[model samples]
Target: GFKQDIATLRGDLRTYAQDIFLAFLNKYPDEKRNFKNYVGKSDQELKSMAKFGDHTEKVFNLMMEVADRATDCVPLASDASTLVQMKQHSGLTTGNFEKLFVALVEYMRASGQSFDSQSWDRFGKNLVSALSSAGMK
Candidate 1:
């Protein structure tokens, strides 16, 4: 029941992908340096950039994909592999991913989605582990 509800929340959250990504960057402002396209851009300026919007959509779509397969080990493993590649190629560390996941969970609670915080935190940790095991150092 909780997993299903989480999946539903993920689907609904996709509608606010921009806000989600903004919150993520807001929480980890220093991490913005890692995004070459987002460097030296104001939040408002980022909104004006097509690259920012496109990257936001990709991030959310990947989140939705992982959430949808949360209960299925096979697909989840595959998604983990994809995430590993993305993180490595993007030059972001596992620590960055962990913080992003935390930002997502905080965003969900702040937006009044009302899921079990403990469970969601656990899931987020598991998600970090999934990505970590796939290939991340």
Candidate 2:
């Protein structure tokens, strides 16, 4: 059951990644100006050109990295049971939970994703729903 929750969380992370990418693109139209410019470039050329040294370019790089990391991260099966076990074995409090949750979100965002208010709200709701499931226990 805990493993299932991890699976669900992974799915949520995927959605979060997509949302981050979309929000970044939506917010920075100029970054998408040369949408088709890198078609024939090598991967290295594309990567190098991606560094446009503007605000939008920075945000675009950040979001792209987030999407890439989210796609690559492997949520361990142990992670599924660890949270509940920590609460059961250790004296975990609400404050601790809040801190941990925030840290997790920050880690995700630091991977190159930006968390807008709307994205945060959506992710928070989804997280609550995931935790409230019977399997989470």
Candidate 3:
């Protein structure tokens, strides 16, 4: 019989998460916006009267959920004996984890959701928290 390797499955999970992230972004274009020039706007201001905004939020939420789910798989992904070595040490703070986690959110929003800058920023933070708690950084 073939062995069920958790590490291999976790690697597959990672790839699946990346695929979903990329696909979600491709489907929503409005969520993607240039961040350099965007400033001082409420989420409503940026995405007002747009149906895509709703869809964008849904997809973004889904992506975060997937990441959160992956956290459960992390234990299976790594050996318990080496857990301390892989604990991320100084870089696992909530803030730093959220920062890096949002990059994926932004990617989905920008490439798939195509949200305005304001909306992206707003949802990105929310997604980070949701996903982080799921794994809780």
Candidate 4:
């Protein structure tokens, strides 16, 4: 439901998201041998892949859809799909979810999107909460 294009989201989310992904994997390179088709690349190389940008964009799309549908389940459903795909691709288990929660929040702070509105707080927390229920953290 957002009108701004790729140029916008590139500014809006790209760097923080990419850095968080890089940090997440670097913090635990042994967490999973492969990550979402990033077969042989180093962590930095993987961070530069289009997949991270595409994933960041897709997440924004989900956030917008939640804004449109005006339902909590939109995010839950969206995250479930994401969880399934990641599980298939990476087979992450155990502590990855907790690590992700940390990375995601850290990404938020890194993004510097104002938390002036309670909207962002609840939105971010709710997302992690949803992830936990989906069995991540």
Top TM-score: which candidate number?
1
The candidate, 3 or 4, that scores higher on lDDT is: 4
Stronger candidate by TM-score (1 vs 2): 1
lDDT of each: 0.72, 0.38, 0.39, 0.53
Could you give me the TM-score of model 2 versus the true structure? 0.25
Clashing pairs in 4: none
lDDT of 1 by residue, 28-119 (tens): 99888877788777778988898887778778777766776776322377887888786435676678877876887787678665666555
Model 3 per-residue lDDT tens digits across residues 18-74 = 444334334433323323222354444435524434544553454344334343233
Model 2 C-alpha lDDT per residue in residues 61-82, reported as the tens digit of each score: 4333332333123222333244
Candidate 4 backbone clash number: 0
Cα lDDT for residue 57, model 4? 57
Pairs clashing within candidate 1: none
* Decoy 3 TM-score against native: 0.25
Best-to-worst ranking by TM-score: 1, 4, 3, 2
Question: Model 4, which residues run further than 4 Å from truth?
Answer: 1-11, 32-44, 47-94, 110-137
RMSD of each candidate?
Answer: 2.9, 15.4, 14.4, 5.7
Q: What TM-score does each of the candidates earn?
A: 0.79, 0.25, 0.25, 0.48
Q: Model 1 RMSD to the real structure?
A: 2.9
